[model samples]
Target: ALPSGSDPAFSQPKSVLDAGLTCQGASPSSVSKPILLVPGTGTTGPQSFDSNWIPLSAQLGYTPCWISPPPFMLNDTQVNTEYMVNAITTLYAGSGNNKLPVLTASQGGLVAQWGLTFFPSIRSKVDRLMAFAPDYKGTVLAGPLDALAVSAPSVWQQTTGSALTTALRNAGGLTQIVPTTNLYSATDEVVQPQVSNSPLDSSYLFNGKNVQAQAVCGPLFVIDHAGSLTSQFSYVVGRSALRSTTGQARSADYGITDCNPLPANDLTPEQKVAAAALLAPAAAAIVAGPKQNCEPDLMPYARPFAVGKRTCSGIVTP
Candidate 1:
């Protein structure tokens, strides 16, 4: 039986349109193919992108589109999938175009992977796919903590499970349909690094023959799943890394370096707040800055490749 209170037939288009918001400015012609950004579990819609993608979107001259699924504890995979599938179709209809690029983070990545597998039409519509700190494979972190949260009577009523979880556990399936670039952080306290890294092996069943998958690691602090969005790391590493990988150029290269000056070495309480306010606007400006117009070399460290192993005294790699 479908889980109590779970709507097996949830429709995405209906929910979005019924919310009384039109496709205004979201249609393709309005903005160069809109980039759809999906958030991880539990986060409300607007807050999702504010954490990271919003700054980047502002930087790109592109509209930032977000998806806020039902509450996080529900883990209502099937209904959420329907919602996303409908969203993509709606964007297509609004744009009068079939293909769109997608950027998903954390658990949202799993949702995109499922969308590509189950919805062939949507899969055909995606042009470029990027997953930031995504949980393509199930993580041990979710098993004990999340399961308990989802099993609650209040939560169970809102979501479904088992069948969907089984499908997600199969990471190999994702490589089959899209060329996914998996971005991860070595110091992530959430999903295990192996969960994102292990399935890239060519032997995996779902590893797509046409897909190009690589793991890029950034500075531990820069890539922290929780810290990346709000911290300076977003500007220093997150923006740099993303622009590098997506082939977008940095604005500084274009003589647009009017970045709010960095703060002084020591600041008084009032000065600290003032400095922080100044820094915030500058950070936003960085994301709002023009895409690099120059053909900058793709820095190897900028992309999501594995970092060498760490030992007591040093780091090492094969």
Candidate 2:
């Protein structure tokens, strides 16, 4: 049987997964459409969205839920992907089987995309994916980084032409399984060449739109990789996408005037402190944690041939 809603292959008890799926503003069972916030490589769910999106979501009268991958999301991406799949299905079940809208940052985009693509059963349960600065095509910058340092296994898989990247591309090409919005910056420091990089925009997709932050924010406004997450411009675009009827972000609907540096400033004092405290550990993980000697092999299910196949075996946890 296919692994769909809360299946053993993807679902885990809240204790074991450590997903940290905290919902606020409304109960998951009652919200019209809860937003699943997935953080980047080193950040946890609260660290990524607490002071920003979590508050914005509450103001908009929508429930916002977030999940944290164990060990600060430095685990093998396949494992992280499973965590996302579990989040999606758990939310689906909790909300009377309602579909969800996902908001992701950096590597979280890849993990959620992997879940939507590989675990086909969860595809329809997702309304849209809003990603910021996702390196969907992998980056050439990772080549030297992987060779010279003890980068984590997930970092190595993000190198240009890594097995995982190739497999992701071949499995779904640039067609999103659900409506998708890619909010990127032309001058992104990490994921490069967002505009006209090659035969196609590296972040471009057929069933979605690749929105440049500069296009909406103006030439003077520039957002870097990390900046893309908390960027004033990116938040405007992401919120617009989720609010749209089609769930696809439209550049024309918004313009330069909408990029308010502070769109929502109602973060509670407690939330401010929480967001601030998470910075230390998030930064430490980037520099000191999960160093692998070399690029690890792809999980058996993520191999080029295994993609789109109905079987998953020989998968190991970190």
Candidate 3:
């Protein structure tokens, strides 16, 4: 039957969004201008970039707050854009009359762009737009295969030179007047950095983009799609972008060229147990796809790890 709410049958967030968007961490009244974090495709509020952000918040002396849009963040762009716009409005009131800074990963970056482009007030409402390994050109993983992407409308839209991508570009998708930084990996298996039309101007809707697309040697690690956006490596890239006057940063700062081998195989008993627990199958899907409108909860996955220790967060392949 019908749920308690008036929202449509599929509207899962009829309750959550109505309850005053939860901005985990601090009193928005304190910080005049707070950085509003928007997570990537598979992640939500804290689950997305929040964990990594938590540690950095201490560094910044302000706890950054985030909003998890409707279930299945991989849904329609317009829907997610409205969600971002709404969050911005909610936070703006207590912002002490401050313009906000937004940072997002993967599909989340696209969502931010939608808000700025379509939502009239959002353009002036934001001070900085930081995008990490954004699917600016969409992901090749979802592009060619309809079979792989069954219910993923967002995946379909993020494909290389997608209809929406081309549409945005044709209309100057990157017509943003704000300080925007786009950080991407050259070897990303999911999203392509530069396609014929996806980059929109190769600037990809932002004023600045990182150049060191790959690791120099040992192939230790360059950056993967997700890593370039949210990984510790991605943090440096994002922070550097934030501080840059022109929204551009050095290419060398982007990739993980050195290897401080943790050797997960060098197992202490606890480490061994943790490792086993990792290989241990959970009852849930590791990378749960978009949650539907009325869904209960979104599944969790790994988005952050230790500072200098090696992590597989960005490991696309051998």
| Top candidate (lDDT) | 2
lDDT of 3: 0.52
Error (Å) of candidate 2 at residue 75 is: 0.8
- Candidate 3 per-residue C-alpha lDDT over 114-187 given as tens digits, one digit per residue, 9 for 90 to 100: 55644556665787777766665465565435443244446555665555454444434555556777755555
Ranking by lDDT: 2, 3, 1
Single out the weakest 10-residue window by summed lDDT for candidate 2. Answer: 309-318
TM-scores, all candidates, are 0.57, 0.82, 0.67
lDDT score at residue 218, model 3, on the 0-100 scale: 30
lDDT of 2 by residue, 47-135 (tens): 77876777766677668888888778777777778778777877888787988888887878888777776787778789889987787
TM for candidate 1 is: 0.57
Q: Identify the runs in model 1 with alpha carbons over 4 angstroms from their true place.
A: 1-13, 16-31, 72-75, 143-163, 169-172, 193-197, 200-222, 228-318
Q: What clash count does candidate 3 reach? A: 5
Q: Kindly provide the TM-score of model 2 when superposed on the true structure, using C-alpha atoms.
A: 0.82
Computed on alpha carbons, the lDDT of every model, listed in order, comes to: 0.43, 0.69, 0.52
